[PDB]
Amino acid sequence: MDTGEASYYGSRHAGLRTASGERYNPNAMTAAHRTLPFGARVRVTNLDNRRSVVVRINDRGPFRRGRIIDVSRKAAEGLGMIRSGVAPVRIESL
Template sequence: MASYYAPRFSTRRTAAGGRFDPNSDTAAHRTLPLGTVARVTNLANGRSAVVTIRDRGPHARGRIVDVSPRVAEDLRMRDAGVTRVILQPIAVPATGSRRRG
Protein backbone atom coordinates (compact mmCIF):
# COMPACT_ATOMS: atom_id res chain seq x y z
CA MET A 1 0.00 0.00 0.00
CA ALA A 2 1.14 3.52 -0.79
CA SER A 3 0.02 6.86 0.54
CA TYR A 4 1.20 10.40 -0.06
CA TYR A 5 2.63 13.22 2.03
CA ALA A 6 0.15 15.63 3.60
CA PRO A 7 0.57 19.33 2.72
CA ARG A 8 1.85 20.08 6.24
CA PHE A 9 5.15 18.37 5.38
CA SER A 10 6.01 20.95 2.71
CA THR A 11 9.50 22.42 3.33
CA ARG A 12 10.24 20.13 6.31
CA ARG A 13 13.62 18.40 6.30
CA THR A 14 13.81 14.90 4.87
CA ALA A 15 16.04 12.14 6.23
CA ALA A 16 18.42 12.91 3.35
CA GLY A 17 18.81 16.46 4.71
CA GLY A 18 17.03 18.50 2.04
CA ARG A 19 13.71 20.27 2.26
CA PHE A 20 10.63 18.36 1.13
CA ASP A 21 9.21 19.72 -2.13
CA PRO A 22 5.66 18.52 -2.89
CA ASN A 23 6.38 18.89 -6.62
CA SER A 24 9.42 16.60 -6.54
CA ASP A 25 9.82 12.87 -7.15
CA THR A 26 10.50 12.27 -3.44
CA ALA A 27 9.35 9.10 -1.69
CA ALA A 28 9.77 7.66 1.79
CA HIS A 29 10.62 4.03 2.57
CA ARG A 30 11.61 2.44 5.86
CA THR A 31 14.65 0.44 4.77
CA LEU A 32 15.78 1.15 1.19
CA PRO A 33 18.98 3.20 1.17
CA LEU A 34 18.48 6.94 0.78
CA GLY A 35 19.13 7.86 -2.85
CA THR A 36 17.56 4.68 -4.22
CA VAL A 37 15.69 5.24 -7.47
CA ALA A 38 12.57 3.10 -7.79
CA ARG A 39 9.50 2.60 -9.95
CA VAL A 40 6.12 2.74 -8.20
CA THR A 41 3.22 1.18 -10.11
CA ASN A 42 -0.41 1.70 -9.14
CA LEU A 43 -2.04 -1.74 -9.37
CA ALA A 44 -5.52 -0.25 -9.81
CA ASN A 45 -4.72 1.49 -13.10
CA GLY A 46 -1.22 0.44 -14.23
CA ARG A 47 0.20 3.97 -14.06
CA SER A 48 3.78 4.21 -12.84
CA ALA A 49 6.26 6.87 -11.77
CA VAL A 50 9.96 6.92 -10.96
CA VAL A 51 10.80 8.20 -7.46
CA THR A 52 13.90 8.82 -5.37
CA ILE A 53 13.94 7.64 -1.75
CA ARG A 54 14.87 10.73 0.27
CA ASP A 55 12.97 10.15 3.49
CA ARG A 56 12.00 7.51 6.05
CA GLY A 57 8.46 6.26 6.48
CA PRO A 58 5.64 5.67 6.03
CA HIS A 59 4.70 5.48 9.66
CA ALA A 60 1.20 4.09 9.10
CA ARG A 61 0.83 0.34 9.49
CA GLY A 62 0.55 -1.69 6.30
CA ARG A 63 2.05 0.93 3.98
CA ILE A 64 5.32 0.44 2.16
CA VAL A 65 5.91 3.85 0.58
CA ASP A 66 4.83 7.49 0.86
CA VAL A 67 5.11 9.55 -2.31
CA SER A 68 5.02 13.29 -2.97
CA PRO A 69 1.69 14.85 -3.97
CA ARG A 70 2.98 15.30 -7.54
CA VAL A 71 3.80 11.60 -7.82
CA ALA A 72 0.41 10.76 -6.28
CA GLU A 73 -1.19 12.83 -9.04
CA ASP A 74 0.91 11.05 -11.71
CA LEU A 75 -0.27 7.72 -10.29
CA ARG A 76 -3.88 9.00 -10.14
CA MET A 77 -4.15 8.05 -6.47
CA ARG A 78 -4.82 11.44 -4.85
CA ASP A 79 -8.58 10.96 -4.59
CA ALA A 80 -8.22 7.51 -3.03
CA GLY A 81 -5.38 8.63 -0.73
CA VAL A 82 -4.07 5.07 -0.41
CA THR A 83 -3.63 2.48 -3.15
CA ARG A 84 -2.02 -0.89 -3.78
CA VAL A 85 1.35 -0.59 -5.53
CA ILE A 86 4.41 -2.49 -6.59
CA LEU A 87 7.72 -0.86 -5.66
CA GLN A 88 10.68 -1.92 -7.84
CA PRO A 89 14.17 -0.56 -7.08
CA ILE A 90 15.94 0.55 -10.28
CA ALA A 91 19.22 1.87 -8.88
CA VAL A 92 20.47 1.34 -5.33
CA PRO A 93 23.47 3.39 -4.18
CA ALA A 94 26.48 1.49 -2.95
CA THR A 95 26.70 1.39 0.83
CA GLY A 96 29.75 0.95 2.98
CA SER A 97 32.21 1.25 0.11
CA ARG A 98 35.42 3.08 0.89
CA ARG A 99 38.04 4.34 -1.48
CA ARG A 100 41.54 3.22 -0.77
CA GLY A 101 44.38 5.34 -1.92
Protein backbone atom coordinates in the same frame (compact mmCIF):
# COMPACT_ATOMS: atom_id res chain seq x y z
CA MET B 1 9.61 -6.54 -6.32
CA ASP B 2 7.47 -5.82 -3.27
CA THR B 3 3.87 -4.80 -2.61
CA GLY B 4 2.03 -2.71 -0.06
CA GLU B 5 -0.07 0.39 0.45
CA ALA B 6 1.16 3.76 -0.86
CA SER B 7 0.17 7.09 0.64
CA TYR B 8 1.10 10.68 -0.16
CA TYR B 9 2.42 13.52 1.97
CA GLY B 10 0.26 16.42 3.04
CA SER B 11 1.38 19.94 2.18
CA ARG B 12 1.72 20.62 5.90
CA HIS B 13 5.12 18.87 5.53
CA ALA B 14 6.35 21.15 2.74
CA GLY B 15 9.61 22.84 3.71
CA LEU B 16 10.24 20.53 6.68
CA ARG B 17 13.32 18.33 6.81
CA THR B 18 13.18 14.77 5.60
CA ALA B 19 15.56 12.17 7.04
CA SER B 20 17.84 12.72 3.99
CA GLY B 21 18.17 16.38 4.92
CA GLU B 22 16.21 17.63 1.91
CA ARG B 23 13.24 19.83 2.72
CA TYR B 24 10.10 18.03 1.57
CA ASN B 25 8.98 19.44 -1.78
CA PRO B 26 5.55 18.43 -3.16
CA ASN B 27 6.81 19.20 -6.68
CA ALA B 28 9.71 16.73 -6.48
CA MET B 29 9.43 13.03 -7.41
CA THR B 30 10.46 11.76 -4.00
CA ALA B 31 9.34 9.14 -1.52
CA ALA B 32 9.82 7.59 1.91
CA HIS B 33 10.83 3.97 2.42
CA ARG B 34 11.97 2.19 5.58
CA THR B 35 15.26 0.77 4.33
CA LEU B 36 16.27 1.70 0.76
CA PRO B 37 19.34 3.94 0.59
CA PHE B 38 18.71 7.66 0.09
CA GLY B 39 18.84 8.39 -3.63
CA ALA B 40 17.58 4.94 -4.66
CA ARG B 41 15.27 5.03 -7.69
CA VAL B 42 12.07 3.01 -7.42
CA ARG B 43 9.37 2.29 -10.00
CA VAL B 44 5.97 2.46 -8.31
CA THR B 45 2.91 0.97 -10.06
CA ASN B 46 -0.60 1.72 -8.82
CA LEU B 47 -2.29 -1.68 -9.01
CA ASP B 48 -5.75 -0.10 -9.21
CA ASN B 49 -5.09 1.72 -12.52
CA ARG B 50 -1.71 0.36 -13.73
CA ARG B 51 -0.19 3.85 -13.84
CA SER B 52 3.49 4.03 -12.91
CA VAL B 53 6.10 6.59 -11.90
CA VAL B 54 9.73 6.58 -10.79
CA VAL B 55 10.56 8.18 -7.45
CA ARG B 56 13.78 8.84 -5.55
CA ILE B 57 14.00 7.84 -1.86
CA ASN B 58 14.74 10.79 0.45
CA ASP B 59 12.91 10.00 3.70
CA ARG B 60 12.01 7.41 6.30
CA GLY B 61 8.72 6.03 7.34
CA PRO B 62 6.15 4.88 6.46
CA PHE B 63 4.71 4.66 9.94
CA ARG B 64 1.96 2.00 9.65
CA ARG B 65 2.19 -1.80 9.14
CA GLY B 66 1.04 -2.58 5.62
CA ARG B 67 2.19 0.78 4.22
CA ILE B 68 5.30 0.38 2.03
CA ILE B 69 5.94 3.84 0.56
CA ASP B 70 4.85 7.46 0.97
CA VAL B 71 5.15 9.60 -2.18
CA SER B 72 5.18 13.30 -3.01
CA ARG B 73 2.09 15.10 -4.27
CA LYS B 74 3.49 15.22 -7.80
CA ALA B 75 4.16 11.47 -7.72
CA ALA B 76 0.62 10.87 -6.45
CA GLU B 77 -0.70 12.82 -9.45
CA GLY B 78 1.33 10.60 -11.79
CA LEU B 79 -0.09 7.53 -10.00
CA GLY B 80 -3.68 8.80 -10.23
CA MET B 81 -4.07 8.48 -6.45
CA ILE B 82 -4.93 12.05 -5.38
CA ARG B 83 -8.63 11.32 -4.81
CA SER B 84 -8.22 7.75 -3.56
CA GLY B 85 -5.59 8.94 -1.06
CA VAL B 86 -4.05 5.51 -0.81
CA ALA B 87 -3.56 2.70 -3.29
CA PRO B 88 -2.06 -0.77 -3.45
CA VAL B 89 1.27 -0.56 -5.25
CA ARG B 90 4.05 -2.69 -6.61
CA ILE B 91 7.54 -1.29 -6.10
CA GLU B 92 10.74 -2.25 -7.86
CA SER B 93 14.20 -0.88 -7.03
CA LEU B 94 15.96 0.15 -10.23
